[PDB]
Amino acid sequence: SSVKLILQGRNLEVSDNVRSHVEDKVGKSVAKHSHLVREVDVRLSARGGDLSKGPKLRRCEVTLFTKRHGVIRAEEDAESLYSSIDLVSSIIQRKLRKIKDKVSDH
Amino acid sequence: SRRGTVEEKTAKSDPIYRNRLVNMLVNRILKHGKKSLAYQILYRAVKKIQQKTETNPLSVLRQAIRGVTPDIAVKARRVGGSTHQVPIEIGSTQGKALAIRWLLGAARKRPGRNMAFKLSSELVDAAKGSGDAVRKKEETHRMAEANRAFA
Amino acid sequence: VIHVQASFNNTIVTVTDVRGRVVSWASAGTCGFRGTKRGTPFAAQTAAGNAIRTVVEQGMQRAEVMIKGPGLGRDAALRAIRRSGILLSFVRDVTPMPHNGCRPPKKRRV
Amino acid sequence: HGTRKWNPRMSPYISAKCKGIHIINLTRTARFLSEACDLVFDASSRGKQFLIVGTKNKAADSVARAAIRARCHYVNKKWLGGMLTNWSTTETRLHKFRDLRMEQTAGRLARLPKRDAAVVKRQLSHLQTYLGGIKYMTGLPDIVIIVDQQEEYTALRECITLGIPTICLIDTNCNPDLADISIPANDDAIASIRLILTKLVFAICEGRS
Amino acid sequence: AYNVQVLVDDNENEERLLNRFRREVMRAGVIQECKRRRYFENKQEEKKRKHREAAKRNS
RNA sequence: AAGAACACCAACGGCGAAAGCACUCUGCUGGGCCGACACUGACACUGAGAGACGAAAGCUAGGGGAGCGAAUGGGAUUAGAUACCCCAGUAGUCCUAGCCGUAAACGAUGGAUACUAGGCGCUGUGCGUAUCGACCCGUGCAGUGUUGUAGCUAACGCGUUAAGUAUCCCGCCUGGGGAGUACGUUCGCAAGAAUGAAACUCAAAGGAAUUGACGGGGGCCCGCACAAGCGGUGGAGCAUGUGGUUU
Ligand SMILES: [Mg+2]
Ligand SMILES: [Mg+2]
Ligand SMILES: [Mg+2]
Ligand SMILES: [Mg+2]
Ligand SMILES: [Mg+2]
Ligand SMILES: [Mg+2]
Ligand SMILES: [Mg+2]
Ligand SMILES: [Mg+2]
Ligand SMILES: [Mg+2]
């Protein structure tokens, strides 16, 4: 809790039901190490189908800057928007847990 | 750096007193790249020290560096174990410049009319035991003897 | 006699006569150290000095040191005992030697 | 050579043995000395070019002088790979090496700097170390002689690859199946070398006519 | 019940006593055997240990 | 006073069908090797069923219980810690009767026999030379290890102790998952062991080796990478860009 959030309509408009789905996922992965991070960067995109040529694909780029010189870069691609958000959140929880295991190595 | 062979700089001396200690003392005063103003801060100070003490200011300056110089310090290390601060000795040149920072550092902090007065009262007080820079020597020297064991 | 027990967490120094009746003692903990600083070799020097200094005043120039166990302070304690005003005959180490007697603990994982 | 060094391959060509040391057979080789000198004498009459491969320190200069008596070729230093097999690269280095001796005659060394002249000096010096006895070959030999099998193991294999008969070191160190012509007893000393080397080099002289 | 003895009475130096004490106890191997007997070791560790000791002494 | 276990000797080591057997002796007792001039006269090999032995763990009674230690508590590390760490600690670990009959019970390699280059050194027991005091040296036999030729092998590697060349006999496999599961049967005090499917489902699963990438693997080195120093940003006010909202 007490962490800001940044969305970005790269190639589309950000709806409200989508915004609720974003906060639900990263809210789980970040609530664990909530006292290490201050902000959450997000950038949603869309391509293909009716917009462009090729398969419909929606990207979700997520960057995270902790309170102690921590940098995370996560980028995945899926056929739907929610599925893209889900896969990235799993990657953040993996690397975000990797940091504590190194700090708590003793 | 990774070379380990730093060139030895040409330690110069002032025109009047012709000693290299004074020139090392001046180079820490300026911060915008001007030397003509530091002497107006210095030559007014050493004259003011002579006005008060009735003796050469050179010995008073040589005594202050002799008293504030700790010749020992503590550095943090965690190559073995977590959060260790064991002592470490200091050379002759390193301890010399190390005392200049503490003197001029305390002079800027303490109140006064000008840097010449703030610097004059610092050296005169620092030479006579009681000085804000001498307190930092005691604090740094305390941490060494406190953590005298290598742990 | 000067029984000394070395270890990684502490170093003990007990003085006693040949008959086995202690007169004085002091360890790194009594000196002021605590935690991991006790096992350091410097603590053995200061701990040994405070225990033997009172003994040199009360005569008994003769002495025998009985080392017991490993540690970093066992060698540093000799410098403390040697840097003194007493002679010595034995520098023997009365350590245990089990011939496969009991079961030791399990190995540590961390 | 010894109880811990005798190869079971030479067992047909062993007669007896002694305290530690080994005794080679001089009977079977005498037939091959005749077959060798008969083939070398017959081959030299047709005008072929031969080669000798000697790099052992004890017989480095002996093989050098051995080649001056005839119009054959020697290899004093190491084999450096692909001498005969990669002949296309060898002609490039020999055409190169042949030219540099003409380069030194010109007065172009004056207009070169100090360091550049040193590289050209050390360049030609390196090729002289390995390309000395080949300067007048101009082609591939037809028979190649091996003085040492162990130290020059690479030279014996390119002959088998290119299909060239050869002479070998059939003493107990090596394998006799590698060369068709077999002459043991050459690892003893220069006596075993010069007695055989001068004998075979001698036969080349009358064969040359 | 002892393991090592040094009957010095007046050494020529303060630090040279360790030369007579360390190397003497080293040949007896008191430090290595106590580290061994601290934690239990299986038959696998014994074979690996004694094998490394031999390879260290042989060459 | 008690219980349990035997440093050093100790390995490139010995014995045993394996599992396994190491502080010392003594008793009873099994097996192997060699020698030779007593003898037997193919009385051999393998082995379905069956039978015996069979690490630890665990079970059924009776004893014992020092130390160590599942479980269970407590103190810490952690977002959490029913874990790793630390302090205490039950069953069990030990003995005598018996059950259980499973392990990476591995040399991941069934047994017997004949043939097939060598090099090193370790035992056991002979022969001969020799100092004939043993030793040493040289060889035979039966074993035990390490390199390695031919040959085999997908490759790694095996290689006179074969994973080579051949014969005889037993067991065993026929894509993966479902599954060593379900039903039934036999044994077992139980825990569970052995025997052992099908429906349905995928077009793979898997082996060796190569190349990169990666590693809280190792070694070395470099950059204002850190450290050290000097001066700023983040706060204030105002330039000016982007988002967002608004239009
Ligand atoms: Mg059966
Ligand atoms: Mg049991
Ligand atoms: Mg099984
Ligand atoms: Mg086993
Ligand atoms: Mg099996
Ligand atoms: Mg088997
Ligand atoms: Mg092999
Ligand atoms: Mg593989
Ligand atoms: Mg820095």
Query: Which experimental approach was used here?
Result: cryo-EM
Using a CB–CB cutoff of 8 Å, tell me whether C75 touches chain E: yes
Q: In angstroms, rounded to a whole number, what is the distance separating the alpha carbons of residues D173 and D151?
A: 11
* In chain E, beta strands by DSSP E: none
Q: On the CB side of C13, how many CA atoms lie within 13 Å of its CA?
A: 30
Measured in whole angstroms, the distance separating CA A71 from the mean position of its chain's CA atoms is 13
Is residue A46 within 8 Å of residue A58, measured between CB atoms?
yes
Q: Dihedrals φ, ψ of D20, to 5°? A: 80, -60
Measured in whole angstroms, the distance separating CA D120 from the mean position of its chain's CA atoms is 29
The maximal CA–CA distance of chain E, rounded, in angstroms, is 48
Q: Dihedrals φ, ψ of C45, to 5°? A: -65, -55
Cβ contacts of E5 on chain C, cutoff 8 Å: 90-92
Q: Beta carbon of C18 within 7 Å of strand F?
A: no
Contacting residues for E15 by C-beta, under 8 A, at least 6 apart:
C79
Contacting residues for C5 by C-beta, under 8 A, at least 6 apart:
C11, C12, C13, C14, C68, C69
Q: On the CB side of D61, how many CA atoms lie within 13 Å of its CA?
A: 0
Token pair of B143, please? Answer: 């941490």
Token pair of B12, please? Answer: 């110069």
Token pair of C46, please? Answer: 């200061």
Is residue B64 within 8 Å of residue B103, measured between CB atoms?
yes
Instruction: Give the Å distance between the CA of B67 and the centre of ligand 2.
Output: 75
Best mutation target among E5, E13, E20 (most C Cβ atoms within 10 Å) is E5
Query: What order do you get walking across the sheet with A58-65 strand by strand?
Result: A41-44, A58-65, A71-78
Residue D42 vs residues D37, D165, D184, D209: alpha-carbon distances, Å: 8, 14, 22, 11
Residue A60 vs residues A72, A81, A82, B82, B123: alpha-carbon distances, Å: 14, 8, 9, 39, 64
Token pair of A46, please? Answer: 């869309």
Is residue D176 within 8 Å of residue D170, measured between CB atoms?
yes
Strand partners, D104: none
Token pair of A98, please? Answer: 């990797």
Is residue B58 within 8 Å of residue B17, measured between CB atoms?
yes
Helix ranges (DSSP H) in chain C: 28-31, 41-57, 73-82
Give me the DSSP letters along D18-46.
Answer: -SSSEEE-SHHHHHHHHHHHHHHHHHHTT
Is residue E18 within 8 Å of residue C75, measured between CB atoms?
yes
Contacting residues for E16 by C-beta, under 8 A, at least 6 apart:
none
- Which nucleotides along chain F are within 7 A of a protein C-beta? 3-8, 10-12, 66-69, 77-79, 84-86, 117-120, 138-139, 216, 221-227, 229-231, 243-245
SS3 C5: strand
Residue C57 vs residues B47, C13, C20, C52, C66: alpha-carbon distances, Å: 57, 17, 20, 9, 21
SS3 D14: strand
Q: Beta carbon of E45 within 7 Å of strand F?
A: no
The identity of residue A17, as a single letter, is N
Q: Beta carbon of A9 within 7 Å of strand F?
A: yes
Resolution limit in angstroms? 3.0
Give me the DSSP letters along D91-157.
Answer: HHHHHHHHHHHHHTTSGGGTTS-HHHHHHHHHHHHHHHHHSSTTTT--S--SEEEES-SSTTHHHHH
Q: Phi-psi category of C71—alpha, beta or left, where left has phi over 0 and alpha has psi -120 to 50?
A: left
Ligand located closest to E44 CA: 4
The maximal CA–CA distance of chain D, rounded, in angstroms, is 69
Among D158, D159, D160, D184, which Cα is nearest to D172's?
D184
Strand partners, D146: D53
- How many Cβ contacts (< 8 angstroms) between chains B and C? 12
Is residue A58 within 8 Å of residue A47, measured between CB atoms?
yes
Contacting residues for B111 by C-beta, under 8 A, at least 6 apart:
B118
Question: In the 48-107 stretch of chain C, whose C-beta falls under 7 Å of nucleic acid strand F?
Answer: 97, 99-106
Q: Which helix (H) or strand (E) holds C24?
A: strand C22-27
DSSP state of B134: H
Measured in whole angstroms, the distance separating CA C8 from the mean position of its chain's CA atoms is 12
Contacting residues for C106 by C-beta, under 8 A, at least 6 apart:
E39, E40
Among C87, C38, C96, C42, which Cα is nearest to C67's?
C96
Q: Which helix (H) or strand (E) holds A27?
A: helix A16-32
- How many Cβ contacts (< 8 angstroms) between chains C and E? 64
- Asked whether the beta carbons of residue E37 and residue C104 sit closer than 8 angstroms, the reply is yes
Using a CB–CB cutoff of 8 Å, tell me whether C61 touches chain E: no
Min Cα distance C27 → chain E (Å) is 22
Token pair of A89, please? Answer: 């959140």
Q: On the CB side of E28, how many CA atoms lie within 13 Å of its CA?
A: 17
Q: In angstroms, rounded to a whole number, what is the distance separating the alpha carbons of residues A92 and A84?
A: 13
SS3 B113: coil
**F69 C1' to C60 CA distance, Å:** 48
Buried b (16+ CB within 10 A) or exposed e, B21-36: bbebbbeebeeeeeee
Best mutation target among E11, E15, E19, E21 (most C Cβ atoms within 10 Å) is E21
Which own/partner contact pairs does A46-54 have at CB distance under 8 Å and 24+ positions apart? A46/A10, A46/A11, A46/A12, A46/A81, A47/A11, A51/A11
Q: What is the CA radius of gyration of chain E?
A: 16
Q: In angstroms, rounded to a whole number, what is the distance separating the alpha carbons of residues B42 and A21?
A: 68
Is residue C82 within 8 Å of residue C56, measured between CB atoms?
no
- Asked whether the beta carbons of residue C33 and residue B149 sit closer than 8 angstroms, the reply is yes
Surface-to-core class of residue A40, CB atoms within 10 Å of its CB (0-12 exposed, 13-18 middle, 19+ buried): buried
Is residue D171 within 8 Å of residue D185, measured between CB atoms?
yes
Which own/partner contact pairs does E13-19 have at CB distance under 8 Å and 24+ positions apart? E14/C79, E14/C82, E14/C83, E15/C79, E17/C78, E17/C82, E17/C91, E18/C75, E18/C78
Buried b (16+ CB within 10 A) or exposed e, C47-74: bbbbbbeebeeeeeeebebbbbbbbbbb
Cβ contacts of C87 on chain E, cutoff 8 Å: 9-10
Is residue D95 within 8 Å of residue D37, measured between CB atoms?
no
**F181 C1' to E56 CA distance, Å:** 53
Give me the DSSP letters along B55-101.
Answer: S-HHHHHHHHHHHH--SEEEEEE-SSSSSEEEEEE--HHHHHHHHHH
**F15 C1' to B112 CA distance, Å:** 97
Q: Beta carbon of A28 within 7 Å of strand F?
A: no
Share of chain A residues as helix, strand and coil, in percent rounded to the nearest 5: 40, 25, 35
Share of chain C residues as helix, strand and coil, in percent rounded to the nearest 5: 35, 20, 50
Measured in whole angstroms, the distance separating CA D53 from the mean position of its chain's CA atoms is 1
Token pair of B102, please? Answer: 């503490």
Residue C23 vs residues C2, C13, C16, C19, C53: alpha-carbon distances, Å: 10, 11, 6, 11, 12
Is residue B29 within 8 Å of residue B41, measured between CB atoms?
yes
Whose structure tokens read 């079977």? D28
The length of chain D in residues reads 209
Cβ contacts of C93 on chain E, cutoff 8 Å: 2-4, 25, 30
**F51 C1' to A89 CA distance, Å:** 65
Angle, in degrees to the nearest 10, between helices B132-146 and B92-109: 130
Of C82, C90, C106, the CB nearest to E17: C82
Q: Which nucleotide is nearest to E49 (CA to C1')?
A: F10
The end-to-end CA distance of chain A, in Å, is 27
Q: Which nucleotide is nearest to A14 (CA to C1')?
A: F244
Pairing relation of β-strands D166-167 and D143-146? parallel
